[PDB]
From a paper:
For instance, Olorinab® (APD371) is the most polar CB2R agonist reported to date with a cLogP of −0.426. APD371 mainly formed hydrophobic and aromatic interactions with residues from ECL2, TM2, TM3, TM5, TM6, and TM7. The carbonyl group of APD371 formed a putative hydrogen bond with S2857.39 and a hydrophobic interaction with F872.57. The pyrazole and pyrazine cores of APD371 formed aromatic interactions with F183ECL2. Furthermore, the pyrazine core formed hydrophobic contacts with T1143.33, I186ECL2, L1915.40, and W1945.43. The (S)-1-hydroxy-3,3-dimethylbutyl head formed hydrophobic contacts with residues M26N-terminus, S902.60, F942.64, F1063.25, I1103.29 and V1133.32. The cyclopropyl group formed hydrophobic contacts with F1173.36, W1945.43, W2586.48, and V2616.51. APD371 acted as a full CB2R agonist with a pEC50 value of 7.9 ± 0.1 and a higher maximal activation compared to that of CP55,940 in the functional assay. The responses of APD371 for CB2R-H952.65A and CB2R-V2616.51L were significantly impacted with 158-fold and 10-fold drop in potency, respectively. Our data revealed that LEI-102 and APD371 do not enter the receptor via the membrane channel like HU308, but gain access most likely via the extracellular space.
Residue numbers in the entry:
A (entry chain B): 3 to 340
B (entry chain S): 2 to 121, 124 to 235
C (entry chain A): 3 to 54, 182 to 232, 240 to 354
D (entry chain C): 7 to 63
E (entry chain R): 21 to 227, 237 to 319
């Protein structure tokens, strides 16, 4: 009977919640009460990257921490030299509606995806001096909200059909399909060892997927609104979920539950973009009120504020060496805040 | 990708000729193309350069005001109009693509070359070994020495290592030193001291029998080193 | 200048990319984007054939003006998470079938699509170009049964002049922003041929009024 | 039929319920200890001098 | 010689003086107010059309302060006013009453491109194109106005008795210069209202409020421009035929106060009509409530 299957799911939901309450002896806010705070963190705009002509929807640094690709809705995908502010590449796309972009960890490939239900991978380092479409990965039945390169052969895309998928690039095909969400998967993020990844959907829940196995390991039902963005703690044993109810929340995978809440009463608009700094002490959130807050991650209190954007900061990313922070907003400007 | 040129032959001394390098197989309008000549018994010397979109144009000291470089982006061809050809212009003119961005490999593909034959402050590179006696399989070392420190302020050291196999055009091996051209084997590696440089070949083979040229790229004119010929 | 020979030519590649970014951005700034948002499958496929993967852009050109019509109804996701990409669109081409009032109700479902899109926080200034399709099929549905099936609070008689003027006023009622935006109503069907000419007349009033906010005249 | 979907919800919750969870006092001391151990390698926490900073503008 | 060509004194001299500082300071308080609302909002300065409204507020602010300092000096103070320095004081007021009128033509042409080419108006006029036509306006208005101080004396020909130390032929040459800049306004603002009636009759032919919204604005713009400048410029042309045996030159100094009345009404009609200036005026106070 169907009415017994809702029941034994709830009695299994109880023992998850009972074992969640069994392990909460003290919160992370209780341990970091006597710890030196990081003070005011004031970061000046070093570079301001011009040249875009529409709303910037995503960026992604390279592993070399000097190149960043940046998609925008004018149908362009510019690759920047972040030190001396040159455009290395300007890749004209097949459609303007691009909602995410990626950068392969080797540097040879760049994938952008958007409202076309498609993920198109570009080839940077090649003969003929072109940036041509290496592959176009079709099979999603919704807008492709985030794509992240595992390596040069595999890419994990998150679409709005309540499904993440793992692609093979050398033959465009869904290797494993990561089902289990009940809402549009708004943003994913990969673990540093890339055996696991998290994906925060529009059902107030992020998950923890085993990449090689295909299943969902844990379900982190802590929020109350749409999880617009997500990022990993650099240890890989914790993550942070920027929501639409203006609360970043730091979970962790070993304790299976929520640790903190980065809530302030002066903010009411949600978070478009979360990225930890290197060493994971700061938690740079990206809000809709033209702002970026640099939250401490051991204490909850706000350390600094990155103000200077004229529209919604839609994307931010700290470099792999932790030197800079590039927040690309809805006005056609990226800003690099060392 | 290929670059085939046309022109040359017996020219009267003091005449004129147009050298035409027709580029087929790559995005020609984004490559800042060079012209590099080679005297019949000497090493390379850089002749002319035109950018992408024909913005900047440079020449050597010998051809400034005497030659003229020009490119045709729709027709995918590159020209070199030279007037008053002296008897020191008898050479074989290569046609070298070179794109410049961050992490690019300039000078990567070279044209085949057309034997022109007329009738009858620069960073002085010095490859001291004119010829190295070589047994196959051993480890050989080609040493190049600059006359100005090529290490720029941005960390890059603009020295390029070329190999010209006997009967072929110079192939790029190593761009800005200890890099590697995409397509050459792992045995090449270049470890330099900012003003004195070294090429290391580990497991030598008969495909590496040739002449090795070290080329600066710090400032124009792009002075090539002399010949380091490796013989079995 | 302290730039090397390669760093001088990496800046010139950037400044040539900047030339191709402005010359392709000014080409796309002279184009009119029109988010076509016909509710359901009613009337939406008629006016794309009259005027000439999830999102189906239908490019066409009338009187040296290039229209882009982003038919986006084949997405079937949550609409609030990607509708802000269409912020800054010139207009919105809504499509209502007039004859679906007998076919909750289908006409009332297309009012909830209109009410949720005309008071959206991104489309507070994009003028809806409302197309009431199926007019030549709306007349015979009226003469077989009055409007009183769909609309309970109907005071006028059954005939077509009072019914079609009522459904025009029911959709011009759902906007609360009467000052920032306008609703250009047309009464089309499959046999009409002016429906490419009406869009050019309706977007040229939009871009004129959008230009008169820029110079401070309005 | 929802008999095969809601059972998959049960086998998902049965598989999720069997993980050993360490307590928060252990799994937050490590997030404190990772932040203290790697604190010197952070150029945003501690401001790097302008000689070693590649962004000087 | 500089003093006696203006014989105007008596019981009117306080009304000529206090009207140059009550209308001179409020025009200075209103023009820097608009110049502060554009430059501090920093999304208006990138908009290329508020540069023409902003430089109109700039060309009018100097047209209000220099007409304040020169006119009460000449009527109730009676300074030294030597041969070389006064031609600067009469040129610095003529430059800013030409660059103001030139800015009204510069913003009429800008409002003409809103309607003649509606969709490509952002590409025909950008921030880079708006500044190079603002630069060539400011130096051309300076070159035709600072004409007699570089070289002229009025040695061979009779120089005019309205403006002292100023040639009569240049007054014939400056009036006809402005008469095109007026004809560049009435033909333009008449063609904005004509290219809109062609459009309103075209849209309403399928199934009036755009024209009447324009004519209530552009009609008052053309009304507030011509009921003050033409009293200055009608009898300035009448000064060349007859040498004004009666006190018409007395009435000019009162009528030359109309072009300072035209100062403060320019931000009320051009800038206060702008809904973004109206929104930025209520946004800039919330920055300054602390
Ligand atoms: C001499 C002064 C004290 C400055 C007063 C006269 O008491 N002068 C003017 O108020 C005044 N002079 N001009 C003017 C003068 N010149 O020589 C040429 C062209 N215009 C103009 C005005 C305003 C009319 C706008 C044009």
């Amino acid at each position: 009977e169907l009415d017994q299957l809702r029941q034994e799911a709830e009695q299994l939901k109880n023992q998850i919640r009972d074992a969640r309450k069994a392990c909460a002896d003290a919160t992370l806010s209780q341990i970091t009460n006597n710890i030196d705070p990081v003070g005011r963190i004031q970061m000046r705009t070093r570079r301001t990257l011009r040249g875009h002509l529409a709303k910037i929807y995503a960026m992604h640094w390279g592993t070399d921490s000097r190149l960043l690709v940046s998609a925008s809705q004018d149908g362009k995908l510019i690759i920047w030299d972040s030190y001396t502010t040159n455009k290395v590449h300007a890749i004209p796309l097949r459609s303007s509606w691009v909602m995410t972009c990626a950068y392969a960890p080797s540097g040879n490939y760049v994938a952008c995806g958007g409202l076309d239900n498609i993920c198109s991978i570009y080839n940077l380092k090649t003969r003929e001096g072109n940036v041509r479409v290496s592959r176009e990965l079709a099979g999603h039945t919704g807008y492709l909200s985030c794509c992240r390169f595992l390596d040069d052969n595999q890419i994990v895309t998150s679409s709005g059909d309540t499904t993440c998928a793992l692609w093979d690039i050398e033959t465009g095909q869904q290797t494993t399909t990561f089902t289990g969400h009940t809402g549009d998967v708004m943003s994913l993020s990969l673990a540093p060892d890339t055996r696991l990844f998290v994906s925060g959907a529009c059902d107030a829940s992020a998950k923890l997927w085993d990449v090689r196995e295909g299943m969902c390991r844990q379900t982190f039902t802590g929020h109350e609104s749409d999880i617009n963005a997500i990022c990993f703690f650099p240890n890989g044993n914790a993550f942070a979920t920027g929501s639409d109810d203006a609360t970043c929340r730091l979970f962790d995978l070993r304790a299976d539950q929520e640790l903190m809440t980065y809530s302030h009463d002066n903010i009411i608009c949600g978070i478009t973009s979360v990225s930890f700094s290197k060493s994971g002490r700061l938690l740079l959130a990206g809000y809709d009120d033209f702002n970026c807050n640099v939250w401490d991650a051991l204490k909850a209190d706000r350390a600094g504020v990155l103000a200077g954007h004229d529209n919604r900061v839609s994307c931010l990313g700290v470099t792999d060496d932790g030197m800079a922070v590039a927040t690309g907003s809805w006005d056609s400007f990226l800003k690099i805040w060392n | 990708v290929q670059l085939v040129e046309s022109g040359g032959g017996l020219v009267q001394p003091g005449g004129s000729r147009k050298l035409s390098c027709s580029a087929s197989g790559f995005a020609f309008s984004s490559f800042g193309m060079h012209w590099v000549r080679q005297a019949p018994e000497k090493g390379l010397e850089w002749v002319a350069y035109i950018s992408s979109g024909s913005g900047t144009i440079y020449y050597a000291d010998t051809v400034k005001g005497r030659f003229t470089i020009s490119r045709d982006d729709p027709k995918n061809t590159l020209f070199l109009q030279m007037t008053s050809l002296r008897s020191e212009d008898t050479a074989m003119y290569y046609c070298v693509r070179s794109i410049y961005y961050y992490g690019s490999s300039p000078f990567d593909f070279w044209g085949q070359g057309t034997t022109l034959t007329v009738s009858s402050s620069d960073i002085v590179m010095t490859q001291a070994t004119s010829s190295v006696p070589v047994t196959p399989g051993e480890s050989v070392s080609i040493s190049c020495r600059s006359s100005k420190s090529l290490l720029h302020s941005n960390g890059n050291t603009y020295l390029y290592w070329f190999l010209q196999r006997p009967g072929q055009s110079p192939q790029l091996l190593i761009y800005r030193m200890s890099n590697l051209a995409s397509g050459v084997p792992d045995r090449f590696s270049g470890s330099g001291s900012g003003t004195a440089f070294t090429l290391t070949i580990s497991r030598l083979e008969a495909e590496d029998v040739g002449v090795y040229y070290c080329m600066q790229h710090l400032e124009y004119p792009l002075t090539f080193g002399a010949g380091t010929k490796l013989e079995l | 200048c302290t730039l090397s020979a390669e760093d001088k030519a990496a800046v010139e590649r950037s400044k040539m990319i900047d030339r191709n970014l402005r010359e392709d951005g000014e080409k796309a700034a002279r184009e009119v984007k029109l988010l076509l948002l016909g509710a359901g499958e009613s009337g939406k496929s008629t006016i794309v054939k009259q005027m000439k993967t999830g999102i189906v852009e239908t490019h066409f050109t009338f009187k040296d003006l290039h229209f882009k019509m982003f038919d986006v109804g084949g997405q079937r996701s949550e609409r609030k998470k990607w509708i802000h990409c269409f912020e800054g669109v010139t207009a919105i081409i809504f499509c209502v079938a007039l004859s679906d009032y007998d076919l909750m109700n289908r006409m009332h479902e297309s009012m909830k699509l209109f009410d949720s899109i005309c008071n959206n926080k991104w489309f507070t200034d994009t003028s809806i170009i409302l197309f009431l399709n199926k007019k030549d099929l709306f007349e015979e549905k009226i003469k077989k049964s009055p409007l009183t099936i769909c609309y309970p609070e109907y005071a006028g008689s059954n005939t077509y002049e009072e019914a079609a003027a009522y459904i025009q006023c029911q959709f011009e009622d759902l906007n609360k922003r009467k000052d920032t935006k306008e609703i250009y109503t047309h009464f089309t069907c499959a046999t009409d041929t002016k429906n490419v000419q009406f869009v050019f007349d309706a977007v040229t009033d939009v871009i004129i009024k959008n230009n008169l906010k820029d110079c401070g005249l309005f | 039929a929802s008999i095969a979907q809601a059972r998959k919800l049960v086998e998902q919750l049965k598989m999720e319920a069997n993980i050993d969870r360490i307590k928060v006092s252990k799994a937050a001391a490590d997030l404190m200890a990772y932040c203290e151990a790697h604190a010197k390698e952070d150029p945003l926490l501690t401001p790097v001098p302008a000689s070693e900073n590649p962004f000087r503008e | 010689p500089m003093k006696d060509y203006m014989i105007l004194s008596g019981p009117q001299k306080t009304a000529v003086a206090v009207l140059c500082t009550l209308l001179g300071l409020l025009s200075a308080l209103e023009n820097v107010a608009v110049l502060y609302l554009i430059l501090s909002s920093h999304q208006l300065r990138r908009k290329p059309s508020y540069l023409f409204i902003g430089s109109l507020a700039g060309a009018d602010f100097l047209a209000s302060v220099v007409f304040a300092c020169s006119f009460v000096n000449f009527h109730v103070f009676h300074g030294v006013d030597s041969k070389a320095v006064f031609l600067l004081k009469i040129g610095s007021v003529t430059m800013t009453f030409t660059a103001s009128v030139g800015s009204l033509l510069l913003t009429a042409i800008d409002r003409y491109l809103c309607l003649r080419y509606p969709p490509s108006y952002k590409a025909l006029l950008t921030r880079g194109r708006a500044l190079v036509t603002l630069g060539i306006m400011w130096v051309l208005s300076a070159l035709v106005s600072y004409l007699p101080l570089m070289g002229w004396t009025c040695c061979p020909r009779p120089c005019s008795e309205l403006f002292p130390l100023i040639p009569n032929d240049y007054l014939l040459s400056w009036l006809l210069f402005i008469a095109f800049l007026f004809s560049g306004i009435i033909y333009t603002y008449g063609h904005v209202l004509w290219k809109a009636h062609q459009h309103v009759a075209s849209l309403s032919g399928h199934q009036m409020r755009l024209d009447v919204r324009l004519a209530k604005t552009l009609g008052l713009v053309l009304a507030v421009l011509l009921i003050c400048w033409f009293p200055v410029l009608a009898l300035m042309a009448h000064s060349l035929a007859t040498t004004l045996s009666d006190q018409v030159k007395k009435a000019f100094a009162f009528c030359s106060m109309l072009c300072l009345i035209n100062s403060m009404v320019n931000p009320v009609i051009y800038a206060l009509r702008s809904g973004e200036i109206r929104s930025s005026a209520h946004h800039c106070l919330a920055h300054w409530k602390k």
